[PDB]
Amino acid sequence: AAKDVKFGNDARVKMLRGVNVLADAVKVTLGPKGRNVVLDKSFGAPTITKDGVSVAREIELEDKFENMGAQMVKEVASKANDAAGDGTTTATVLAQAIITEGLKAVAAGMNPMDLKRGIDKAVTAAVEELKALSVPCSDSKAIAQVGTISANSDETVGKLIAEAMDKVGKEGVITVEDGTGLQDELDVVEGMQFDRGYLSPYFINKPETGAVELESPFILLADKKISNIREMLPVLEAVAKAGKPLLIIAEDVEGEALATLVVNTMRGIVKVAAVKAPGFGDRRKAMLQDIATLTGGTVISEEIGMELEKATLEDLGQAKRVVINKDTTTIIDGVGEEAAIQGRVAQIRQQIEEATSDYDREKLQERVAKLAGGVAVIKVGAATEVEMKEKKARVEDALHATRAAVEEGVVAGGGVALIRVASKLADLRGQNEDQNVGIKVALRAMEAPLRQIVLNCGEEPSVVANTVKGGDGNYGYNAATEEYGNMIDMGILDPTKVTRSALQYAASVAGLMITTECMVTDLP
Amino acid sequence: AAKDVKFGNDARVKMLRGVNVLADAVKVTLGPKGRNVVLDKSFGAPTITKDGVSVAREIELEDKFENMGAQMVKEVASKANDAAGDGTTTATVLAQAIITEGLKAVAAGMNPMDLKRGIDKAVTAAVEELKALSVPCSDSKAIAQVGTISANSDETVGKLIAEAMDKVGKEGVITVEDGTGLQDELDVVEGMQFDRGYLSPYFINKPETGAVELESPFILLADKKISNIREMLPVLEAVAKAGKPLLIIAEDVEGEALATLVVNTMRGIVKVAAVKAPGFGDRRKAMLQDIATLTGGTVISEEIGMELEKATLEDLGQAKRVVINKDTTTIIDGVGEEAAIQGRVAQIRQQIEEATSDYDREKLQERVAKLAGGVAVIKVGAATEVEMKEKKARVEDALHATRAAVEEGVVAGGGVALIRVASKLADLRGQNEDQNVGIKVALRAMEAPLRQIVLNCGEEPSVVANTVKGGDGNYGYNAATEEYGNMIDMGILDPTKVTRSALQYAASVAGLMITTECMVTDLP
Amino acid sequence: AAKDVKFGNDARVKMLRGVNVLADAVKVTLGPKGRNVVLDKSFGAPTITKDGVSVAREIELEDKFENMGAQMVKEVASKANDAAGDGTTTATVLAQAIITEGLKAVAAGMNPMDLKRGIDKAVTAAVEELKALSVPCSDSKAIAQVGTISANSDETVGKLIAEAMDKVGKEGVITVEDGTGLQDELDVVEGMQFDRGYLSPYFINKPETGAVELESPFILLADKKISNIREMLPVLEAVAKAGKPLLIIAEDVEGEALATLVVNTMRGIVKVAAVKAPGFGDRRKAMLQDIATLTGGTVISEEIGMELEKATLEDLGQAKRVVINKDTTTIIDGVGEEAAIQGRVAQIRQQIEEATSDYDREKLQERVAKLAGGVAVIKVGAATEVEMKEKKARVEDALHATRAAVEEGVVAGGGVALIRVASKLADLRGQNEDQNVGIKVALRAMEAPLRQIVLNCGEEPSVVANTVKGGDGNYGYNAATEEYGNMIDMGILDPTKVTRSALQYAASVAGLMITTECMVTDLP
Amino acid sequence: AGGGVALIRVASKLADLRGQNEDQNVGIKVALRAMEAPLRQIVLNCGEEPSVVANTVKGGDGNYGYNAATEEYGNMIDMGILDPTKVTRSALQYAASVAGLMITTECMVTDLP
């Protein structure tokens, strides 16, 4: 197909215009005073919302180059959620703030490379300053404060989350499910989570949640390549007869099997999920055996001598629930026997004692920790289903926030930490004038999010920005009360991880984009 | 009338367009490798010329705003010519460089005030360094070298220039006249020069020369306003009867008399020109008295009861020749008697001895210097009239150059000194990013002349400029021979004053441009 | 007035277009096979012609830049006529070829000034080659051969020219006048010719002749500037009363006097011709005195105290006829008495005896020769005025040709000399590829005119071109006979001067044009 | 050596190559001048003025050249900025082949839009 080509100035300015469109469309939601956006729904009624994530997913421009520019920033910003639940809006705002001045500098004419390297130096210094400014949060009381703050001051949810974390350490896996009644329950159950996403978004039965949820699904553990549906005919027939869902845990699925499963999911003929086995090689095999033990199924591999055309519900693994995402997957309430689990635990512990290699010993330590940590599930109870669901959503939000908090302490929110570190790093310099103007650009961008928040409030931005910069420490301007003081004292704060991730990703996109000479795309 | 108004970018871009068009039309003539430019002339065939001054004078753009920019640049750059001979090409090339870079920086969003301040500071530093690098010219040998260089290897012309300089002192006014015979002559005749010029271009009997010349005209000495032509009635009647030209020196001329003289010259009724009386007040009165003594004329005043309507041919002074310019006016070969001249000289000497006040002492000192020995003139003899003509032209140019030399020394030519000082002034810095960028802009800009010259040669301008910058002292690249070496040896020396004035004027125009925000121009 | 400005290739393309149209309109006429061209005449019926000079004179293009190029080429070619009448078409063809090749090379990127230098060096080599190849033209036999060749093989006019040349030596000025009978007459008459043309184009009573002719006009010798018609009142009125024509010779005529004389000529009030005095200063005064002695008039100047306001017909000198050319003026049949002529001749002879320097002796020798050589008149005789007129025109052309031939030898025609030197100059080279390509351009283009003539013959051009190149000496292709052989034997030949000047002028135009980068024209 | 340093050096080494006519000579000059193109382009990508570094490298001999990474000079071999001979030779030869085939193009046949 004939491809249009643009070089230098025109291409970069087109991308900049697209980026400005996206930023103007998204940032308006930022801040407690966040405005509203309306999303056209051709089939039915429109929906109001403030979720920058939703607005971003909806944005798609007409001109190809503008669409290109918008989409790249969308893609990078999405990873803010993958990192720490929230932050996409901050990432996009920083992207616009950097890129505007950066491309202005380019147009004026300076070594774009030197500008990029200066940006990177400034961002690294910013990361160091964030680490210095961070405040740890591991105590139960601080954890509860963070959680309730995230959930809009719900001490009950905060306490529940803190109790779950105490019960299963701060590394265990936590999940949420609907409470049977008004009360709430904190359980301990077998299961395990591993860094594996879904093989195709089509598997998503819960698109609004951006996840895959399955109830009492069968489990398949085939440690080998998968390309042909013919291999899965008997298990598929048995699953259809039973009516329960299926899960596919294999080395990989492609070709005919992949296409057939995709078609079935698209037409909803059968609900089944697939994901690549965690890890690789020998440790992957060991983890698969562990999963079989925990699930009550059986590992099947041609090297062992059994075929997928002979597998039956008896040796197929079974569990009462599982959850899968674009990134991670977890097992809920397996079927494996606790005695067998303990035997496997002792076996792997003995293997650890045998393991002289430090790396392999750490791998086995992680495996045994995952196996023995079980799983903790919190049951959300409310008078009405609506209340239950809202509390569940807030619980997930606070759980993500607390995860990030235990990960990287916490810092004052409202972009206050960003502007504070910006003021601190005012005397950073590079190896050339272009690099130094890059430093200036980086700082001018880091000043943006607070200005946007204030603009949303109504008061003139630069006034409050300068006042806060003149302040120090945790000092800042609370939008909620439209006053000044300490965010930590006022109870507003952000998980340092989100700020770090947003700044780093914004710097990455700016660096990639400022170094674009030729674009190419398909003609209409 | 309704006016078209532009603000900011919409206006500065247009001024940049006009300036760039003018620069592209002019600079091509720079350097010993100057190209050819065809200038239209709606009488017959077009004229090929290499005179950047003529090219600029002819340049004028259709668009109102582009014409505005081009005309203002022309006007200001012309001051370099008026001060130190040629001036124009270097002034325009510089102005273009600084204006382009400054507008690019301003579009880059930098404080224009600080940009202008930095440019001016760099100009100051460059002026000081150039003065330091100046090669003094205080000897007959150096004067002759400069003269022959200016006249393209004319040792005899240089020798004549040196002889005249010695005869009439360095500051002594000098001019040239067509030689009567083959041999050249250096005579001394009574005359005087004062910093005044004609009032209307219509008085220019020799528009090609840009100067007014009259042979044995009459001289008017009325130190009062010329209210009405009634005063000029008997004067013009007697002048027409005598069939002679007439020179008018008056304190002031009103609109009626000015327009009457304008129409008289347009119709050529009488060869009459007007010039402001030198100086003002008492010193003006004294100078007019001295002029009367020199010319044999009579002072006309109401205090003495002597009015113009009663004036006769006797009252007006005479002098065999006269020359006038934009601001330079000289009386040549006055008719007054040496006895009266000596008497006035003695009177002024006694006044000097009586002068307790310094200011008045120096006033009388320049008066006596002006009156001492009158003027020395060059008789440009040649075998044929053509030879006489071009010898006279080149001799006048060399005279201007030698004046500039004896004034402000001399430096390496071809604009090399500009880069020689720019490289040395790299360490200069301002009080913020804006001033720093302005300084760097000026530092880059000064390269323009040499780079344009080498480009005309066709060699790699960047390579040659880098080599010269690596060089030192008067070492440089002779575009004429396409060789390197010390510019002093090959004798390509540019007068210091012309370069200084060109740089100053370019800086002034650049500052006024950058500081401009709004234009008002008539609707096209 | 705003001007349209063009640059670079987009500028020189229009110059090339203009030159191409001019060449395609002129060159076709060149050669014995000259194709007819018909010129517009608003008066009515058009005119068929092959006069390339006329065709060029009548060319004017709509586009301003094409007009510029065509006018420049026309004016430069005009110098071919100025030199020897012929050669204008040859110059135009050479200009077309050189310009096309040079602009093509410039498009190739070759350095323009290096190209120009190569062109000029090759041209100088060709000049010296032709100088070597020249065959002397002198003595009765060669004079008669040249004359009859010029007059289309008319031994009659050839013999007349030879007899006149013998009568009046070599440098003796000769003239052509209408006779009174069938037979012809040679004579010695009093007159003189000086290098001064008409002071206004309106003085050309014979526009077809491009020269002034007056029958027994009065002669005015005013050795002073002439600015006002008031000076010429009495003489003009006396001339009008007498009804005779008037000739004006003055040191300078300008301003109101010139304007009034032009108005009178346009209105036919009085037949007046104006010309500047010869030379300058002392030699000008001496020549004016000699002219007065020859004419019987009196020199008028303020130095003697005699004013033109008192001049009379008796005061003015008289001669039966006078002629003024584009650049030279001649007086025929002066009234000055032989006694006075001998007296002045002896005075100047004594002055020669007192003469010291070779410069003075040569000047005086030239003056005495011009005075004492007299003049000869070719009284064309024939049966009818028509044939008399054609014979007169042929005599004029043959006189020009013979003058040039005796001046600078003579060489074969048909550009065969050009191609011969082109062949001889294969070896030449230069310091760089640009110089070499310039040389090749020069040779190839200089080879063009013979190809054009052949193309007019209807034969294949390159065949004859290479045949001649293979040939040697004066061997060539006689277009009239359509046969090869020696030009000298077949009586085909042209003056050396005409071809030399044509080549030089074409080279000069090519250099000037290729050195063009910027063009400025009035807006259409 | 890499960075087009070998190509520019050889191009320098071919100063006085010649052909049987000026057309061949200009063809050779075109080839040699084109040889420099990669080094000039990479220098431009550095953002600094190309001809400077081009002539600077042409002045030296052996392996002296320009390093983009360090922005400095030295023995390109010692910094390890080097390429296999085969790749550069094949690139030059293929470029020459395609250029010759293109320059020898007179007529064109293709389908309409």
Numbering used by the authors:
A (entry chain N), B (entry chain E), C (entry chain D): 2 to 525
D (entry chain H): 413 to 525
Sentences copied from the publication:
pmcChaperonins prevent protein aggregation and promote correct folding through ATP-driven cycles of binding, encapsulation, and release of substrate proteins. GroEL subunits assemble into a tetradecameric complex composed of two back-to-back rings that surround a central cavity. GroEL binds to non-native proteins through two apical domain helices (helices H and I) that form a hydrophobic collar around the entrance of each GroEL cavity.
We formed binary complexes of wild-type E. coli GroEL bound to the model substrate protein R. Rubrum Rubisco. A 4.4 Å cryoEM map of GroEL-Rubisco was reconstructed from 65,453 particles. Extra density inside the GroEL cavities was attributed to bound non-native Rubisco. Non-native Rubisco was positioned at the level of the GroEL apical domains. At these lower contour levels, Rubisco density filled the top GroEL cavity and contacted all seven GroEL subunits via helix H, helix I, and the underlying hydrophobic segment. The strongest contacts to Rubisco were in helix I, consistent with previous cryoEM studies of different GroEL-substrate complexes. Perhaps most surprising is the interaction with the positively charged residue R268, which was consistently the strongest interacting residue in our cryoEM reconstructions. However, our cryoEM reconstruction showed Rubisco bound in both rings simultaneously, albeit with different occupancies.
